[PDB]
Amino acid sequence: MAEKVLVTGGAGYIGSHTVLELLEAGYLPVVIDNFHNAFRGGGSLPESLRRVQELTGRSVEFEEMDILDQGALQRLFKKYSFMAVIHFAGLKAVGESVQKPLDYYRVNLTGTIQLLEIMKAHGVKNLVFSSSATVYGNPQYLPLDEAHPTGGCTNPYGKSKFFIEEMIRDLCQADKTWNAVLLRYFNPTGAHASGCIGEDPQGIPNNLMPYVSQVAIGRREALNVFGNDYDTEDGTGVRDYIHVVDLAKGHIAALRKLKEQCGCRIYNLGTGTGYSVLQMVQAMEKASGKKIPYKVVARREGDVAACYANPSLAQEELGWTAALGLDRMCEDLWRWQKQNPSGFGT
Amino acid sequence: MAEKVLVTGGAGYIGSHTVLELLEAGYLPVVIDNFHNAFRGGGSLPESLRRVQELTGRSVEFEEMDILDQGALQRLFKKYSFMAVIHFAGLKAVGESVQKPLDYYRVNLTGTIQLLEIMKAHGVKNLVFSSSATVYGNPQYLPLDEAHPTGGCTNPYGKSKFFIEEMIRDLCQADKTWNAVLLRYFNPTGAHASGCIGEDPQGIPNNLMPYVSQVAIGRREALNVFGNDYDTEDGTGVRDYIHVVDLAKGHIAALRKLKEQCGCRIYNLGTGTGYSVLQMVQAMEKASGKKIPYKVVARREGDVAACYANPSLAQEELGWTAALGLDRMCEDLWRWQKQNPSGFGT
Ligand SMILES: NC(=O)c1ccc[n+]([C@@H]2O[C@H](COP(=O)([O-])OP(=O)(O)OC[C@H]3O[C@@H](n4cnc5c(N)ncnc54)[C@H](O)[C@@H]3O)[C@@H](O)[C@H]2O)c1
Ligand SMILES: NC(=O)c1ccc[n+]([C@@H]2O[C@H](COP(=O)([O-])OP(=O)(O)OC[C@H]3O[C@@H](n4cnc5c(N)ncnc54)[C@H](O)[C@@H]3O)[C@@H](O)[C@H]2O)c1
């Protein structure tokens, strides 16, 4: 495989993991990031990628740049021969999307548009887009499948995701030579089994794990449980979490699919089983050996009882399955944290 | 009124008419256009605006520029003091949106984003956005009102419109100091009573009138009527057409509303009565004095029986009403055409 794979936002959480899977699988990745939300390593790379090289014994090509920079993109594309692009570059803090909508739309939509245009200009018509199952909006049924209506999104982040999917679909509709796999998933968690890489501490987490996990290290007193009266097995809310490793590998599987001139395809990635808040607390206690006290507070406005995806189609068409469960997610997460209390540091 | 009103895409069909109404009403407009879809006048202006000056005896400031050009926008904003912006700049040929989606998303979304950003940077937080009632998608009920669900759009044009509305809404949600009126309408038709300005002949018309009108001048044999079996008064399809003058004035009304620190408001503009294909043919015969032969062909895939808006809210909140009917639309259109067979010419 003399041809490279471009990974935008490859220094990030999901990107770094994906980059590692790419290396392990025999691919040659070129990564670009502007460091908006990644730690600056000691060398020529971000800390996350420096550790990836160490972990794999393989190297990664990396370029610091912003996808909003057309000049940078032209140069990049002229300098390398890409067989495909995996697009992770973007803003993804849901709580922040509400306070800073323009930045979300600007970076996500505009950035994407710029990217598609350069791809098109360079004849690189193979893309894997890292989407979000939030596009389904509130479940009209469970589990959520690829046939569920999309576009019911409430926040700017969600809408931006959905907007991007639509543009990709339309483009594929207009030009049959394009191949694109849109991957929809919920909450990524866990980290590489080494415990050497993982998710750095985020200002406004998108999910519960980091919170559960803080309470375990004592960096937090007790956990707040919004509602225990839902129509669930245990009364608590049911969410969809997927191990970052499993998710990174699913991105590799989509890349192979492109090769088949698949045109535009859409798949949900997940374990197929949702997890309750209680279940997660239990799982984290088990992994940490620490006690996690919690407090039932009242149900959050808008919160739904359960929200999880059906990943059948991906198994069928991509031959992909999530091998990691709740327990592994907890262990792996716990390990990265214990090992790197503050995330990255040179 | 020493403060100016910026009109993007002001050389166009709807823009020019709006510019005239602005002049007549006492406002000072500054217009920008890149000439993507407007005729280059003899002087310093597009032909459409040159005629507007003549018609009003008032002048317009004009700048040739692209809304995608950030530098141009910065300069513009530094040079003038705007009290508000009326945004018409964009690609709007529905048939073309399908073949060239990227261009649609690029010009419409990106252009808009750039504009909003400069407005925000310059403290110009008052906008009138020329939207499209196509965002409602297929009627789930009639007449379509402001409470009807939006986002069901099938083509790239429609989606782009809807995407823009969402971003504006989110921005207003995040910053309360913003005022924005989103105007949703269907098919603009007719022209200034002078017959001096109107819509130049389009490559891929968005509606039926131009076709009906061609058959009348003999520039076309007979009209094709897709279906005569719809559950309508006459079996033929029911659509929403609005006189361009009435629509231009509604844009003036929205501008006054901004003044009231209205925040984000949305209104449908229309006559409140839909017109059948037959009715239009009749109306055009009356106006032209010419015969318009037509042929019933089979119903178009996807076509709905009737599609029209309820403009009550605008009357209530903007104090606006459509004063012009079908007959005037036909007469006015006929007059512009007879007077200017080929559209603009220096
Ligand atoms: N974290 C989540 O819960 C989640 C959920 C669903 C989908 N996703 C998608 O995953 C992708 C990113 O994944 P993530 O969760 O690892 O977050 P992340 O922030 O760790 O990584 C995104 C990376 O992109 C970089 N980046 C941001 N803007 C950039 C720009 N303009 N140019 C270049 N690089 C830029 C950031 O610096 C960061 O390294 C996004 O497409 C996001 O929508 C994430
Ligand atoms: N024609 C319609 O049926 C219709 C229906 C609904 C809403 N609208 C909205 O009306 C607006 C335009 O109205 P129109 O119907 O008179 O068409 P129009 O083409 O006559 O005018 C649009 C104008 O914008 C200019 N323009 C396009 N891209 C530009 C750019 N990048 N920078 C600067 N100027 C640019 C074009 O040259 C043209 O003068 C759009 O927002 C459109 O979506 C039109």
CSV table of C-alpha atoms and ligand atoms in Angstrom, one decimal, chain B residues 8-16 32-39 65-69 87-93 107-108 111 129-134 157 160-161 183 185-188 199-200 202 206-207 244 247 251, ligand 2:
chain,number,residue,atom,x,y,z
B,8,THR,CA,-26.9,41.6,-1.2
B,9,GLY,CA,-27.7,40.2,-4.7
B,10,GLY,CA,-29.6,43.5,-5.3
B,11,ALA,CA,-29.1,43.4,-9.1
B,12,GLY,CA,-31.3,40.3,-9.4
B,13,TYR,CA,-35.0,39.9,-9.9
B,14,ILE,CA,-36.3,40.1,-6.4
B,15,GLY,CA,-33.4,42.4,-5.3
B,16,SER,CA,-33.9,45.0,-8.0
B,32,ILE,CA,-23.6,44.4,-3.8
B,33,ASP,CA,-23.7,41.7,-6.6
B,34,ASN,CA,-21.1,39.6,-8.4
B,35,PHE,CA,-23.1,39.5,-11.6
B,36,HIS,CA,-23.4,35.7,-11.5
B,37,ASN,CA,-26.9,36.0,-12.6
B,38,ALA,CA,-27.5,39.7,-13.5
B,39,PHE,CA,-26.9,41.8,-16.6
B,65,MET,CA,-18.3,41.9,-5.2
B,66,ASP,CA,-18.8,38.3,-4.0
B,67,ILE,CA,-20.1,37.5,-0.6
B,68,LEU,CA,-17.6,34.7,-0.5
B,69,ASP,CA,-14.9,37.3,-0.5
B,87,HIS,CA,-29.9,39.1,2.0
B,88,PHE,CA,-30.9,37.9,-1.5
B,89,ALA,CA,-27.3,36.8,-2.7
B,90,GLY,CA,-27.3,33.1,-3.6
B,91,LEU,CA,-27.9,30.4,-6.3
B,92,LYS,CA,-31.7,29.6,-6.7
B,93,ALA,CA,-32.3,27.4,-9.7
B,107,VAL,CA,-22.4,29.8,-2.3
B,108,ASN,CA,-25.5,29.7,-0.1
B,111,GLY,CA,-21.6,32.9,1.7
B,129,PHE,CA,-33.4,36.8,5.0
B,130,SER,CA,-35.1,36.0,1.8
B,131,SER,CA,-36.1,32.4,2.4
B,132,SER,CA,-38.3,29.9,0.6
B,133,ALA,CA,-41.5,28.2,1.5
B,134,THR,CA,-40.0,25.1,0.0
B,157,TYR,CA,-31.7,24.3,-3.1
B,160,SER,CA,-29.7,24.9,1.7
B,161,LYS,CA,-32.5,27.4,2.5
B,183,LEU,CA,-39.4,35.6,4.9
B,185,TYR,CA,-42.6,32.6,0.0
B,186,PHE,CA,-43.2,30.5,-3.1
B,187,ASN,CA,-43.1,31.7,-6.6
B,188,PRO,CA,-42.4,35.3,-7.4
B,199,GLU,CA,-37.1,38.9,-14.6
B,200,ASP,CA,-34.7,38.1,-17.3
B,202,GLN,CA,-33.7,32.0,-16.9
B,206,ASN,CA,-38.5,27.6,-11.2
B,207,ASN,CA,-42.0,27.9,-12.2
B,244,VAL,CA,-42.8,40.5,-7.1
B,247,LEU,CA,-43.0,40.6,-2.2
B,251,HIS,CA,-39.2,42.9,2.6
C,2,LIG,N1,-36.5,33.0,-7.9
C,2,LIG,C1,-37.2,32.3,-6.9
C,2,LIG,O1,-38.2,31.6,-7.2
C,2,LIG,C2,-37.0,32.4,-5.4
C,2,LIG,C3,-37.9,31.7,-4.6
C,2,LIG,C4,-37.7,31.8,-3.3
C,2,LIG,C5,-36.7,32.5,-2.7
C,2,LIG,N2,-35.8,33.1,-3.6
C,2,LIG,C6,-34.6,33.7,-3.0
C,2,LIG,O2,-34.4,35.0,-3.6
C,2,LIG,C7,-33.0,35.3,-3.5
C,2,LIG,C8,-32.5,35.7,-4.9
C,2,LIG,O3,-33.7,36.0,-5.6
C,2,LIG,P1,-33.9,35.9,-7.1
C,2,LIG,O4,-35.1,35.0,-7.3
C,2,LIG,O5,-34.3,37.3,-7.6
C,2,LIG,O6,-32.8,35.5,-8.2
C,2,LIG,P2,-31.7,36.3,-8.9
C,2,LIG,O7,-30.7,35.3,-9.4
C,2,LIG,O8,-32.3,37.1,-9.9
C,2,LIG,O9,-30.8,37.2,-7.9
C,2,LIG,C9,-29.8,36.7,-7.1
C,2,LIG,C10,-28.6,37.7,-7.3
C,2,LIG,O10,-27.5,37.3,-6.5
C,2,LIG,C11,-26.4,37.5,-7.3
C,2,LIG,N3,-25.4,36.6,-6.6
C,2,LIG,C12,-25.4,35.2,-6.7
C,2,LIG,N4,-24.3,34.7,-6.1
C,2,LIG,C13,-23.7,35.8,-5.6
C,2,LIG,C14,-22.5,36.0,-4.8
C,2,LIG,N5,-21.7,34.9,-4.5
C,2,LIG,N6,-22.1,37.2,-4.4
C,2,LIG,C15,-22.9,38.3,-4.8
C,2,LIG,N7,-24.0,38.2,-5.5
C,2,LIG,C16,-24.4,37.0,-5.8
C,2,LIG,C17,-26.8,37.0,-8.6
C,2,LIG,O11,-25.8,37.6,-9.6
C,2,LIG,C18,-28.1,37.7,-8.8
C,2,LIG,O12,-28.0,39.1,-9.1
C,2,LIG,C19,-32.3,34.0,-3.1
C,2,LIG,O13,-32.0,34.1,-1.7
C,2,LIG,C20,-33.4,33.0,-3.4
C,2,LIG,O14,-33.2,31.8,-2.7
C,2,LIG,C21,-36.0,33.2,-4.9
